[PDB]
Design an enzyme around this catalytic site. Structure first.
Site, PDB file in Angstrom:
ATOM      1  N   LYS A   1      51.191  51.043  54.221  1.00  0.00           N
ATOM      2  CA  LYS A   1      50.239  50.756  53.157  1.00  0.00           C
ATOM      3  C   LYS A   1      50.400  49.351  52.569  1.00  0.00           C
ATOM      4  O   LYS A   1      49.423  48.640  52.318  1.00  0.00           O
ATOM      5  CB  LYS A   1      50.403  51.784  52.048  1.00  0.00           C
ATOM      6  CG  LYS A   1      49.294  51.760  51.016  1.00  0.00           C
ATOM      7  CD  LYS A   1      49.580  52.711  49.875  1.00  0.00           C
ATOM      8  CE  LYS A   1      49.578  54.165  50.336  1.00  0.00           C
ATOM      9  NZ  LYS A   1      49.955  55.048  49.190  1.00  0.00           N
TER      10      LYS A   1
ATOM     11  N   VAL B   1      41.500  53.859  68.523  1.00  0.00           N
ATOM     12  CA  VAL B   1      41.921  52.558  67.967  1.00  0.00           C
ATOM     13  C   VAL B   1      43.174  51.947  68.608  1.00  0.00           C
ATOM     14  O   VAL B   1      43.343  50.745  68.572  1.00  0.00           O
ATOM     15  CB  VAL B   1      42.085  52.588  66.421  1.00  0.00           C
ATOM     16  CG1 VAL B   1      40.730  52.668  65.739  1.00  0.00           C
ATOM     17  CG2 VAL B   1      42.989  53.739  65.968  1.00  0.00           C
TER      18      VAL B   1
ATOM     19  N   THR C   1      38.703  60.808  66.993  1.00  0.00           N
ATOM     20  CA  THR C   1      39.480  60.587  68.231  1.00  0.00           C
ATOM     21  C   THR C   1      38.956  61.340  69.493  1.00  0.00           C
ATOM     22  O   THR C   1      39.317  60.979  70.609  1.00  0.00           O
ATOM     23  CB  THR C   1      40.971  60.952  68.036  1.00  0.00           C
ATOM     24  OG1 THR C   1      41.067  62.289  67.555  1.00  0.00           O
ATOM     25  CG2 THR C   1      41.633  60.009  67.047  1.00  0.00           C
TER      26      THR C   1
ATOM     27  N   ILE D   1      44.492  62.967  45.798  1.00  0.00           N
ATOM     28  CA  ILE D   1      43.100  63.371  46.023  1.00  0.00           C
ATOM     29  C   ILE D   1      42.987  64.838  46.519  1.00  0.00           C
ATOM     30  O   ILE D   1      43.779  65.283  47.336  1.00  0.00           O
ATOM     31  CB  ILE D   1      42.456  62.409  47.048  1.00  0.00           C
ATOM     32  CG1 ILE D   1      42.754  60.935  46.717  1.00  0.00           C
ATOM     33  CG2 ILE D   1      40.955  62.637  47.167  1.00  0.00           C
ATOM     34  CD1 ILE D   1      42.059  60.397  45.492  1.00  0.00           C
TER      35      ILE D   1
ATOM     36  N   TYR E   1      55.026  55.667  55.072  1.00  0.00           N
ATOM     37  CA  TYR E   1      53.688  55.474  54.492  1.00  0.00           C
ATOM     38  C   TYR E   1      53.625  54.276  53.546  1.00  0.00           C
ATOM     39  O   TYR E   1      52.657  53.519  53.551  1.00  0.00           O
ATOM     40  CB  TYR E   1      53.203  56.749  53.778  1.00  0.00           C
ATOM     41  CG  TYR E   1      52.969  57.960  54.690  1.00  0.00           C
ATOM     42  CD1 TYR E   1      52.878  57.819  56.071  1.00  0.00           C
ATOM     43  CD2 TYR E   1      52.815  59.253  54.160  1.00  0.00           C
ATOM     44  CE1 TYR E   1      52.671  58.910  56.895  1.00  0.00           C
ATOM     45  CE2 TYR E   1      52.598  60.350  54.996  1.00  0.00           C
ATOM     46  CZ  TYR E   1      52.526  60.157  56.363  1.00  0.00           C
ATOM     47  OH  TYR E   1      52.305  61.188  57.230  1.00  0.00           O
TER      48      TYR E   1
END
EC number: 1.1.1.100
Lengths: 228, 226, 228, 226
Positions: free
Chosen positions: D139, D63, D40, D168, D135
């Site tokens: 998604k 974006v 950004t 993760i 979220y």
């Protein structure tokens, strides 16, 4: 008029107790003529006694094509053609037994009733999957849905719907046996925080069985309290 | 009989002016619910009030505005009691509008009614997806959201589910050219368009006390389309 | 280092031709020691000839537990324990045959290799589903995925992944037979506007087989050009 | 070998500064792609340029702004050639921000690169979903959108797919309390956190010429979570 099964002939396999029974009883409340089944003639009599004027029990061996032919001819003779079919319920043997009970028998009996249903452009086939406790049960259950979706596509044009009801953890004879320790591990896995009632499976079946559900086909309806 | 009776329930149906929204509101009224159907304008709200009669009324509602939400719910709480059943029905300009109408508004109004439902340990939220790319993204968003919300609130007696219609007979479908109709049927194995009543039937089932153990489900009413 | 199968022993069932073959060949290019299989000793020799130094053919009857035991002992003896398993490919008979070939045999051979894999905390089981032409094939295919997901959950803790590759319409011996009329109805159903190549299934298998794919388990990987 | 070689491809990786975004960009560079990683800010873009070296560069990208998109793509077209591979990586204020970052931005930038990809009959768009309600809705929106776009463009040699990570190992996970870590593992059957390399491996596969017949897929890299 609303969700009325008056004028329908319903064949419920495994109707002796629990879910099979709760289904048969509800479809009877909704006005259907219920033929509930059992592997023996004694069980068939027990079925006949709880149904009374709303139907009867018949002995049925789903592994035998002649036992299927004769039961359907008998139903056609007393009641009219089956309008609604509800299909209910590690060695090499445990596998091959689960595949026969929970899959092959569901295929066979489904194919058998279809002849008459597609002549009438009207039928309902509903497969109730196994209640959760696995590879063997998982494989059969996913097999039924697999088969349900393909059969659904082939017959929808001829006014027959084919659907699955997939129960979660349901309060039954067996589930009470699991000790206060093993009870909590079950509830831990369910967002609702409770076991499901056999009536709740029967409610899902009867809806799908109704004239109201004519545009629902090839669907798996999960009744599991959020355990997905 | 006590079978699938909505007597004692207050149902909020968004997009109640016509077609599916209307068919829903009417059926929930037949089942005994007190139906507040909604429209973006006060005139549409009146049209709603006329068809419902003693079984409920129409209200003007702007789902993009949190104050318009607050005031409608306080008004419903005041005349009827807290909403027991919520039915959420409804270039750059194409996109951001679809995301607002078919997704964000569904989120907002769902969150708003939840307070009161979890106080009662009883509620029903049902999101009706759009009839068959921007639409795909919104529709998948709602199911996304439906499943996460379902998990969070199932312990407190509220079920959250989606009804996903296929091709349904409406105003729109009378403009389908001679074989443009044929082209759409080709994709539906049942060989016919669905009726708005059939969407309403699915909604009313999931709304019933009987459907208490169904949550986080997508119920497809599509004649085999998928 | 990147997607290298050097040091892996791969058992590929149905390795004589088409997809089975294309898999065996690719896993060989990636450095695996490939034991491809066939129902007969002749087919096993044909396999041995195309593999050369990168492995060999063995005759295998998946319906027989002794034929399974002996093949695995033989592989353990010449090569080391199987690290990668790739499982490849209307009367009462068509059904029960499809359920045996496309489901039960996939269960059995999967369970057999697991012993050795979980001792090593390392293994890959990949089930290739039937290429599309249905109820029987649909039921078996959905059964495999059903089983793949449950087995995946049970063994992931012990370093074994279990996955499915689901092909669409794939260019093979059979598909060329379908006339220029029946060709176009196939392409009509695929967004890509083309048949898939057997190499493309083999690419999906080999990826899942790689050390890189260790966190992928219980997945159905669709290779169908958008025909879903 | 010709196996899974990205030599001759230009890859645009959004969110390339660290973790998964970084691991992706690095691997696509190892496979021979010309990687433009983004941030950004211009400083983050420089950090990206330093780790990539001769295999590509960093660019600043917003974006949410169509002009910032237009100018980045013209710049990439000018130095490298048209983007062949796109990797989209990244109260009311919570919601509308998530919908913008994790959904609308994914839509916009996907649509932008498509023009050039369909002219070449060759492209790869890969959307990396958020690591494990707002979220969930975003998604599911991306997968929704991925599937509809996939269908529309498969005929013209462009594949559109999603990679859906589980839990993760990141910056974030070092703040997980003693048994808060244990609580998260309990949900993953593999008994471990996934590595950012493992997400990058899935992305690079789908990016390969080998994955030409995979489109409209969600590839889950979650150690069995689902």
């Amino acid at each position: 008029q609303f969700m009325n099964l008056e004028g329908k002939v319903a064949l419920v396999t495994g109707a002796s107790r629990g879910i099979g029974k709760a289904i048969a009883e509800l479809l009877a409340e909704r006005g259907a003529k219920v033929i509930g089944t059992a592997t023996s003639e004694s069980g068939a009599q027990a079925i006949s006694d709880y149904l009374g004027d709303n139907g009867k029990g018949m002995a049925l061996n789903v592994t035998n094509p002649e036992s299927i032919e004769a039961v359907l001819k008998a139903i056609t003779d007393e009641f009219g053609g089956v309008d609604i079919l509800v299909n209910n319920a590690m060695k090499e043997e445990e596998w091959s037994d689960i595949m026969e009970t929970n899959l092959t028998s569901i295929f066979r009996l489904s194919k058998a009733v279809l002849r008459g249903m597609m002549k009438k452009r009207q039928g309902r086939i509903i497969n109730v999957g196994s209640v959760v406790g696995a590879a063997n049960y998982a494989a059969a259950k996913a097999g039924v849905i697999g088969f349900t979706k393909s059969m659904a596509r082939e017959v929808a044009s001829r006014g027959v719907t084919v659907n699955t009801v997939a129960p979660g953890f349901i309060e039954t004879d067996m589930t009470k046996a699991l000790n206060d320790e093993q009870r909590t591990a079950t509830l831990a896995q369910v967002p609702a925080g409770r076991l499901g009632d056999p009536r709740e499976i029967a409610s899902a079946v009867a809806f799908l069985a109704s004239p109201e559900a004519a545009y629902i086909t090839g669907e798996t309806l999960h009744v599991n309290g959020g355990m997905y």
